[PDB]
Design a protein around this ligand. Structure first.
Ligand code: NA
Ligand code: NA
Lengths: 61, 120
């Protein structure tokens, strides 16, 4: 598998639906953090969970 | 060794997928096989069964149990076995299969396929 190409873009918080809790990767913290995702999908840095997010974005050194 | 293979697969297939989706796919993914591999991913499994077959005969090892050294890092896999031993031969069968699995298109339509129809 490859690293998600959007892991370092800012999370898309715009509103296009009722808000849901998702995680995005924060490069300046080498962690996935929870945020209010609005469903606009301006980029794919938004995952149903922490595990999925680490999986897709954690930098292997 | 089954347990290592799974560890290896779990690490290369896309994140959203799971081992079960690879357990019964195409004509060869999973236990046994027949016919020709239907697509690219099936080809990975076909070449894996081949590899296990050449190791059991040509080199007298028990593939599904063989113990070995393998390292998972940087989204890749590395076999440390002595270039020639059975644990090394076998590790290479699994490594290239795992790497093949991650780089292959997973066709939803080919999972759990009808064997009597598509594998003759
Ligand atoms: Na098989
Ligand atoms: Na395929």
């Amino acid at each position: 598998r490859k690293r998600h190409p959007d892991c370092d873009k800012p999370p898309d918080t715009k509103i296009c639906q009722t808000v849901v809790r998702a995680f995005y990767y924060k490069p300046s913290a080498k962690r996935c953090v929870q945020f209010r995702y609005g469903g606009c999908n301006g980029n794919g840095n938004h995952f149903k969970s922490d595990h999925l997010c680490r999986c897709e974005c954690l930098e292997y050194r | 060794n089954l347990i290592n293979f799974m560890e290896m697969i779990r690490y290369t297939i896309p994140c959203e997928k799971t081992w079960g989706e690879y357990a019964d796919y195409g004509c060869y993914c999973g236990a046994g096989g027949s016919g020709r591999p239907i697509d690219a991913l099936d080809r990975c499994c076909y070449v894996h069964d081949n590899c296990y077959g050449d190791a059991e005969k040509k080199h007298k090892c028990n593939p599904k149990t063989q113990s070995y050294s393998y390292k998972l890092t940087k989204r890749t896999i590395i076999c440390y076995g002595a270039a020639g031993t059975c644990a090394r031969i076998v590790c290479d069968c699994d490594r290239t299969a795992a790497l093949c699995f991650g780089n292959s298109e997973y066709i939803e339509g080919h999972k759990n396929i009808d064997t009597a129809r598509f594998c003759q």
